[model samples]
Target: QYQVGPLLGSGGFGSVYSGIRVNLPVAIKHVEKDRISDWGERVPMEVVLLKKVSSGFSGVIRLLDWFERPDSFVLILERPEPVQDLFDFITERGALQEELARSFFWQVLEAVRHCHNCGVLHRDIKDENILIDLNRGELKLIDFGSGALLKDTVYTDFDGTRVYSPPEWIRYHRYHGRSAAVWSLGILLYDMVCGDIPFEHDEEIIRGQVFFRQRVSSECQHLIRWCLALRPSDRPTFEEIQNHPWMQDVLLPQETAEIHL
Candidate 1:
């Protein structure tokens, strides 16, 4: 058994605590019965999904051990020090540097690519869910609270934080797999470049205008426009985004031209 220590953080569904595993530090997520449903299926599902995901990204928090009791499940995981959520970074730095954004963005794309390839869709892809371990120089996609298996079916629940939800997500109350992910990615990119979200005020206005409006940065605006289209069919696929000009090692000629302005 791991030697448990002080609590690191807590959320709506659970609390995470620091631990020592084999003399090495680790983190443990303890989901008390008060936090989740009594159905007995949700935590098991997360455990199984996390085990499968661990095989893909060794850098992701490693699942050390798990135990089930009549009331709760305790999961042992690798603990990375000097970690902070992406939202915390943005709040502190005011925005990300271009190169930093590119690097972190690539990590996200890589993780998402792997998950999608394995037939999983992370419905909650937001800054808050991403963690950066500065000492290790690695970024990890965390929190499986809102992930789903990739199938042809549509989930109509208007879940996920409103700050990161895509237009289609607000409109139809469902997502079209990867396209929805792309929309959130665009929002992330926009936040990275501008230091603030374009339409951060007044939810009613954001729903109608911000969802469909075009901003000043034409190239970025165009890119976001495509991703934020009302119809999921209008958005690009994850593979397409991988090969997009924005994701390239070198900036496109147009972006280079924009740099002078």
Candidate 2:
């Protein structure tokens, strides 16, 4: 048994606690069995998917160990020191410079691509689920409670944050993994550059009524539009997005080039 500390956070699934395991710091997620109505005679979905997608990707949170108790299930996860969630990071900085945002966004894109390649769909890709290492520009995509195995089919359950949900989900009540992910990425990019989401209402999103209140570079605008296409078929694929002009213009971390906000 690990020595659990104060509660780190809590969500619909369970509570995360700061803990020490084998003289190293780790995060322990405790999920009460009764609290989960759908879990019946099976391992937690998050654990299954996390184990599947945790390998070969440093940008993903690594699952170290787990214990199944009669009352609750405990998961041991890597706890990177001095990290802040993207929500808090953005809140403190207001809106970041294009270069800074690009650095972070690129990592996010890489992480998503990795997940998709590993046959996993990260249903929730938002600021709150992303952790940033302030000292280093490292990013970790966490919270796989909403994730599922990727399949060539439409998903209707829709358990993620409503703001990041695609227009197709609102209009037709169904959406594919890739397209929905692209839409969320679009909203994430807009929020990163403008300090707010583009469309506050489902009607506005369905109508493609995105207003660029803050000035963004033409290439960035084009990329956003490509990702936010009203039709899922019109949205860019991972390959196309990776090759976009805006994405191509991004400088690597070691570049050390000065960029204006």
Candidate 3:
């Protein structure tokens, strides 16, 4: 048994609470049954996907235990010490240096790739959903509530944040998993480098006009443009992104070594 503490945060469906179990700190996510979308399942989809992806995955938040209540489902997750979400982390620094961004982004890419390989699609890949260890600079992707199992078909019932959606989804209401994932990655990278999103409206995203408000390396710009290509087919795969010039070549300056901490 555990005692729930203060509310950590709340999302579209439920609230996360700081809690202690077996003398260790944990995060308990409480989800209201009525608040969940009808995805044709009695059990919460988040629980199913989290069980599938959390095993043997170091970059993802580990689900420790779960139980069903009369009106809500509770999930116990490992709570790392000295943690902050990427949104808060970025806000504190304004924007990260390219090398710093690269370190965190690489971990994110790895987590995404692992999820995809395991046949899971994290439909919601955003800054707020990613937890960072402030002391070690380690990252853990969280919130599987918006995830789904991958398939060989296009998805139409969008559940993720609109600001991270691909242009195709915005224009046609349909999108593939991989391409849309890349698009969100582009948006995340843009946010990391520029400290803000490139577009605020669907029209601007569809138009695909981006201005480099912050000075970034040419390689970084090229990679962002490739990932944010208007056409889904033009976007590179995770494998390709891993092999990109920028990913292959990140030279950290002597003074920036402490940035990781």
Candidate 4:
């Protein structure tokens, strides 16, 4: 049996509530009919992508169940305890230690890579979209409403946050999935170590330069710059990032437990 509790959060389209599903804790997301995106699929795109990428993975939130109402829909997502978004975590601690950032980044990278392998593009991947559990220090990527099916062509329509978007998308109004993902990852990395994002406006993104607020190791900076490279072709792929020398020191998600996310 399922039971709903107090509201946890809400946005324009819907509200998320703390709930129980089949005796397991979950977050119930209720959205109005008009808010669901078509994405040319029978079900909503968020539902489709969540089912495709998560399954039983720990890197991403689990999609437990779904129900359709006369005028709306509800989604049951995994609810981890003692959780806070990375944005809040960073705000609470100023900036994360390098050791913690590496663990978090490895999980995040693995999750995004899993989505890409499943032919999904998580168009929105920022600190706000990631949930961190204090108990186990686990990171879960949540919210797929901005996702799209992966394709080889350039993407023009943008539904994600502009702060995390790539330079190509800003300058040319288009970008490939991989490049954009790398750019956001670069931004996230900078945010984690420096306690802030590198760019604030469109002009800054195109300029493609980063300045750190505190001391950072050269190898880590090198990898961040590689991802921040202005040219799409210049940026490294997921495999390359995993293989980079800086990453070599940190245990990869797979190597850590032979990763699932």
Candidate 5:
């Protein structure tokens, strides 16, 4: 059994605390029953989606164990010591170098790719949803609260951040998860390299023109633009994103096949 400590962080749905589980430092996420996304199922939607992800992928946060309580569900999760969310990490290190951002970006892509392969869609993809271990140089995508099963259909409901929402989902309520995911990734990448987001309004997204806040490489800008394309059909798939020149050099050869796991 794990011993919980002081409150680490909290939000509307749950509170995360520092805890120890099996001699390992961990995070205990206590989600109130009232906030569970279950439509009558006894389990949280996050538990179901996370259990479907392959353990072979280190980029996705691992759910160690879980417990059901009268008021909340306790999720014991792996916590990389000295870790900080990408948002705070970026805030501390404004405008990351392209090389470093590419490395982190590569890892996130791998994690999301694995989730999709396992028929899961991480509906909430953002800087705040990713954690970076300062000393270890490891990245883990976290917070599956808005996750859903992957399917080849248009999604009418949106649960992710408003800033990351794509134009189609704003003007029209329907969008495929795949394209929306790419758009959010672009927003994330732009935030890392430029120290600010490209768009803060829905009209700017639909208009589809961006100006760089900081000096960014042509290749990096190209990929960002490709992702923020006005039409969802113009966006790239995970395979295409991984193959982009900006991502290829930093990627290890074995990583190409690791997604198969």
Candidate 6:
């Protein structure tokens, strides 16, 4: 067994510590008080969601091993040494290269599409939840604590990072959760290309901007606009997003030509 080391990070729900697992470096997720009742059932739920899909996306952290303790749960997983959350990088660099934007966006959509296919909704999608593994030249999604299996479901809890969340999530307090995700994706892309959020105002002001302000890229504005639509019916499906005008020819020249925005 690898010796568990110091705490790597912490959030409201739990702490993540840096450690060695079987002589390999790893990150271990330690929940302070977990009582999921059925450990066997809970582990498979997340594993199935992660392994069921196949795509060119490389941003999500791969799961390696897991163990349970009497009062807590320990997940021994791949740790991206020197990994940085997108939020911190954004704060430092202000903006991303077009090539990097295209690459990361493509990977995110790929993983999200896979989740959708598996009937999982990543209720919390934001920059902080995204981690960059520079060594492997990959971006992997982490943290499934808020993820749930749902088909055609919607909710509003503002559970994710407030700034990047969709206006509808703030308005109705519970729109289709996936639709909010779409909105968050739009904001993420906008930040990737422009180096800032579309609106620069207070929460109330920005929330209003999502509805009335037209301060966004004319190129990829359509996708964001659709994502902001009042009704879920007005939003585009993942299939439609693949065919969006902004996404067309937007990816890095290195990857497949199939992706456009």
| TM-scores of the candidates in the order shown | 0.82, 0.92, 0.94, 0.92, 0.93, 0.77
lDDT of 6 by residue, 109-205 (tens): 8767767766767767767788876555556777766666655655634345666665665555666656666767777777766666665544642
Query: Can you rank all candidates by lDDT, best first?
Result: 3, 4, 5, 2, 1, 6
Query: Number of clashes in model 1?
Result: 0
- Residues 102-175, candidate 5, lDDT per residue (tens digit)? 88889889888889988889988888999876566777888888888889999988878887889998899889
Lowest-sum lDDT 10-residue window in model 4: 252-261
Off by over 4 Å in 3: 38-41, 249-258
Q: In terms of TM-score, which candidate is strongest?
A: 3
Error of 3 at 196 (Å): 1.1
Candidate 6 local lDDT, residue 202: 42
lDDT of 3 by residue, 1-261 (tens): 988989999976999999999698899999999898834246788888878888884788988998989999999998988789989988888878888888778889999988888888999898998998665567889998888898879998888989999999998999999999999999999999999888889898999977999999999999999999999999999999989988875533222235556
Query: Residue-wise lDDT of candidate 2 within 1-261, one digit each (tens)?
Result: 678889999976799999998587889999888765434228777788788888864689999998899988989998877778888878987877778778888989998988888888988998889987555567889988778888889897778888888999999899999989999999999888888778878888888867788889998898889999999999999888889878877665444223321
Model 5 pairs whose backbones collide: none
Instruction: Estimate, for each residue in 1-261, the C-alpha lDDT of model 1 and write its tens digit.
Output: 788799989977789898898587788887766665323245644566567677745435567678887877888876677677778888887766555666677777778777777666777777777877766556677766566666677777545667677766665567777777887777776666566665554354135244433234455555655655556687777677667666668443234324421
Colliding pairs, model 2: none
lDDT of 1 at 67: 88
Candidate 1, residue 188: Cα displacement in angstroms equals: 2.1
Q: For model 4, how does the per-residue alpha-carbon lDDT over 135-201 read when each residue is reduced to its tens digit?
A: 6667889989889989999888888889899988988899999889999999998888888899999
Give the alpha-carbon lDDT of every model: 0.67, 0.83, 0.87, 0.84, 0.84, 0.63
